[PDB]
Amino acid sequence: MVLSEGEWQLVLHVWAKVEADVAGHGQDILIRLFKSHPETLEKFDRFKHLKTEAEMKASEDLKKGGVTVLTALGAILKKKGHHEAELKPLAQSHATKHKIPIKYLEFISEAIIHVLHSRHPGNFGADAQGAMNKALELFRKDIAAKYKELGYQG
Ligand code: HEM
């Protein structure tokens, strides 16, 4: 699929606000995921034991994981669809080391969209959420295609 430059601009505009606090947004996103979809927590051998939202908030390991996720994702969006080199190593570790089903990527997408909506109401109106949703659906699509070539899912 293809995003127009205007949709890309919508996406990189909100993203620039995210980047004012990568660590905070990363915590919010992971916690939102793990609360909504507890089964995802189990994939994280280093976080698996955390029982409550308060423990999550206090974990320096979870905060570090969030920055990683967002830092990686940010590098992809900034490519505006020309993200083939970037997707390859991510698709390989997520399919063959971590074994992350596509379904779980949909879940974190929903969590990203939830947090932007709460923290940036002004820069995340309907048009901007439609564009981020498209950007994330592109990402998921391309990653699903890579999984299949690598021998996972599909
Ligand atoms: C926006 C989507 C995501 C991005 C950009 C992302 C990116 C990354 C990055 C850059 C790493 C470190 C290097 C590597 O192993 O590839 C990583 C590690 C990891 N990711 Fe993801 N990830 C995403 C989604 C997920 C989801 C949804 C899960 C599980 C439900 C997950 C589970 C893991 C695990 C288990 C590791 C290893 C953590 C540790 O033990 O160091 N990832 N991810």
- For residue 43, which atom of ligand 1 is closest to its CA? 35
Is residue 66 within 8 A of residue 23, CB to CB? The reply is yes
Say if residues 76 and 83 touch (Cβ distance below 8 Å): yes
Specify the number of domains making up the chain: 1
Method: X-ray
Q: Which domain holds residue 45?
A: 1-154
- Rounded CA-CA distance 61/43 in Å is 14
User: Six-digit token pair at 147?
Assistant: 């999984």
Round to whole Å and give the CA distance between 58 and 50. Answer: 10
Residues contacting ligand 1 via CB (< 6 Å): 40, 43-46, 65, 68-69, 72-73, 90, 93-94, 98, 100, 104-105, 108
Resolution value in angstroms = 2.0
- Region of 50 (left: φ > 0; alpha: ψ -120 to 50; beta: rest) is beta
Domain with residue 81: its CATH number is: 1.10.490.10
Alpha-carbon distance values, 60 to 7, 50, 71 (Å): 34, 12, 16
- For 96-105, the CB contacts below 8 A with 24+ separation are 96/150, 96/151, 96/152, 98/43, 99/43, 99/152, 100/43, 101/153, 102/140, 102/143, 102/144, 102/147, 102/153, 104/37, 104/40, 104/43, 105/139, 105/140, 105/143
Quote the CA–CA distance of 35 and 89 in Å, as a whole number.
28
Tell me, letter by letter, the H, E, C secondary structure of the chain: CCCCHHHHHHHHHHHHHHCCCHHHHHHHHHHHHHHHCHHHHHHCCCCCCCCCHHHHHHCHHHHHHHHHHHHHHHHHHCCCCCCHHHHHHHHHHHHHHHCCCHHHHHHHHHHHHHHHHHHCHHHCCHHHHHHHHHHHHHHHHHHHHHHHHHCCCC
